[PDB]
Amino acid sequence: GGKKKVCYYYDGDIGNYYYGQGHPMKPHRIRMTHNLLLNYGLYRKMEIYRPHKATAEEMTKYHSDEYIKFLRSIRPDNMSEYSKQMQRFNVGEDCPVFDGLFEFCQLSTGGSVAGAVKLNRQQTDMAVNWAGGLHHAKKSEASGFCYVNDIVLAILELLKYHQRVLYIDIDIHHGDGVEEAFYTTDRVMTVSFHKYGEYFPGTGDLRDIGAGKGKYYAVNFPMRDGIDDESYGQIFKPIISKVMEMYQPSAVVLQCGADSLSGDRLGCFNLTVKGHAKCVEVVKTFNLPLLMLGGGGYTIRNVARCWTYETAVALDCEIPNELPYNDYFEYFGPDFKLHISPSNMTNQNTPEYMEKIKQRLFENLRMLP
Ligand SMILES: [NH3+][C@H](CCc1ccccc1)C(=O)N1CCCC1
Ligand SMILES: [Ca+2]
Ligand code: NA
Ligand SMILES: [Zn+2]
């Protein structure tokens, strides 16, 4: 038990990176989050750090030299000279070239790796990097609005001092890049809950369980549209409890993508902020070194609410439902409250479906040593 020491990573410049006209990914949401939680007074209870800019050396602990050289070189003014490389590395459409792209990667990654170092040094219990969580980036390829996989880099940092690391992903999308990086090792178990079926990235079937020494160390919980707080709560705690019991990790990384909330512009789930944050509460109870990361999230008022509340949860600090005045106060109308209501959308995940998938995953977890 007990309240935990929390270190939080933020760079004020993050909100100025712009993916381009009409692109749904808005780094500004991280600044909105920051401003809201400062206005609730949460800075009084945690240490706030500005991350360093991760170097090419740091990024090539996972990514290829050629891919990182390309990301460090490509700019809107020289794009026409790089048309071949852009296609090779899947940059230029979903993952656009924007001003300051590499610096955005460096700040996103720096927070996650800095948090992992702090955890390794036993100087904090929890580290938070809401600018992180870019779970789709691959060794030599951008994907899913992600360029550099800060998560994989942070886990590699943790593996210097931790024999077994658990990765949990509650973003609505499958954490495919993290899963791929660790698919053939038992030193990282990856557990993703996600919408599955005619949905990005197309991976994360129940039957994808890892390979080689990593067989049984990837866990995928495929879901349908409309999952609600009750349905999610009923499987998350039992799955994570069984994973904790069987895998016995010494550190945890939790990707908290807010695109699994009700009303998300790109998502199709029906979780409230309380339902999402219940996941952070469950993981926190195991009293392991914990790195909490961001992720997707497209209805930006709800992203700010979600990550503010989850910061409060990390701190065991009760905050009022009445939102404090802040620099983005108009974004939180018409109610100006912290918590959200679910919609009346149909939950396609029947209780029987949820129990059945849970039972199939428990069968796989029985195969751990
Ligand atoms: N979870 C992913 C986005 C990952 C991400 C990218 C950049 C910064 C932070 C998090 C998502 O929502 N996507 C929508 C379709 C393509 C991927
Ligand atoms: Ca997920
Ligand atoms: Na693995
Ligand atoms: Zn997502």
Domain boundaries, the chain: 1-369
Q: Is 80 exposed, middle or buried (0-12, 13-18, 19+ CB in 10 A)?
A: exposed
Between vectors from CA 53 to CA 50 and to CA 57, what angle results, nearest 5°?
Answer: 145
- Ligand 1 atom with least separation from CA of 171: 1
- CA distance linking residue 149 with residue 152, whole number of Å: 5
Give distance in angstroms: CA of 82 to centre of ligand 1.
24
* CA separation for the pair 255, 250 (Å, rounded): 17
Ligand 1 neighbour 267 (Cβ under 6 A): no
Per the CB < 8 A criterion, the answer to whether 292 and 310 are in contact is yes
DSSP 16: G
What residues are neighbours of ligand 2 (ion), with CB under 5 Å?
Answer: 169, 171, 192, 194
User: Of the bound ligands, which one is closest to the alpha carbon of residue 184?
Assistant: 3
Q: Which of ligand 1's atoms lies nearest the C-alpha of 295?
A: 10
- Catalytic, out of 34, 63, 135, 136: 136
Q: Where do runs of H (alpha helix) occur along the chain? A: 28-39, 56-59, 65-73, 83-88, 101-120, 150-158, 176-181, 229-247, 273-284, 300-314, 351-365
Which bound ligand lies closest to the C-alpha atom of 219?
3
Amino acid found at 333:
G
Q: b/e per residue, 333-344, with b = 16+ CB within 10 A? A: eeeeebebebee
314 and 128 Cβ atoms separated by less than 8 Å: yes
Q: Is 145 in the pocket of ligand 1 (CB under 6 A)?
A: yes
For residue 209, which ligand has an atom nearest its CA?
3
DSSP class of residue 187 equals S
Ligand 1 atom 3 nearest Cα:
296
Burial category of 77 from C-beta neighbours within 10 Å (exposed 0-12, middle 13-18, buried 19 and up): exposed
Task: Kindly give the number of the ligand 1 atom that is closest to the alpha carbon of 27.
Answer: 8
Which residue, judged by its Cα, is nearest atom 2 of ligand 1?
296
CA gap 120, 35 in Å, rounded? 29
Q: How far apart are CA 118 and CA 120, in angstroms?
A: 5
Ligand 1 touching residue 30 (CB < 6 A): no
**Rounded to 5°, angle at Cα 93 from 91 and 94:** 90
CA of 225 to the centre of ligand 2 (A): 14
CA of 326 to the centre of ligand 2 (A): 30
Q: Is 217 annotated as a binding residue?
A: yes
Residue 26 assigned ligand-binding role: yes
* Torsion angles phi and psi, residue 303, rounded to 5: -65, -50
Give 337 Cα–ligand 2 centroid separation in angstroms: 27
Neighbours of 82 (CB within 10 A): 18
Burial 104-143 (b: 16+ CB within 10 A, else e): bbbbbbbbbbbbbbbbbeeebbbbbbbbbbbbbbbeebbb
Q: Is 266 in the pocket of ligand 1 (CB under 6 A)?
A: yes
Q: How far is residue 18's CA from residue 197's CA, in Å, rounded to a whole number?
A: 30
Q: Are 265 and 177 in contact (CB under 8 A)?
A: no
Annotation marks residue 276 as catalytic: no
Q: Are 237 and 282 in contact (CB under 8 A)?
A: yes
Q: Which residues have CB under 8 Å from 283's CB, separation 6+? A: 168, 240, 252, 254, 290
The position carrying tokens 């469950």 is 282
Look at residues 211, 212, 213, 216 and name the one whose alpha carbon lies nearest to residue 191: 216
Specify the pairing of strand 126-129 against strand 6-9: parallel
Q: Give, using CA atoms, the residue closest to atom 10 of ligand 1.
A: 295
Indicate if ligand 1 lies below 6 Å from the C-beta of 259: yes
Radius of gyration of the chain (CA): 19
Across 182-204, b (16+ Cβ under 10 Å) vs e yields bbebbbbbbbbbbbbeebbeebb
Order of all β-strands in the sheet with 251-255: 47-49, 6-9, 126-129, 290-293, 251-255, 165-169, 188-195, 218-223
185 is in an annotated binding site: yes
Max intra-chain CA distance, the chain:
57
Ligand 1 pocket member 295 (CB < 6 A): yes
Amino acid type, 5: K
Angle 62-64-66 from CA coordinates, rounded to 5°: 155
Distance CA 214, CA 364 (A): 12
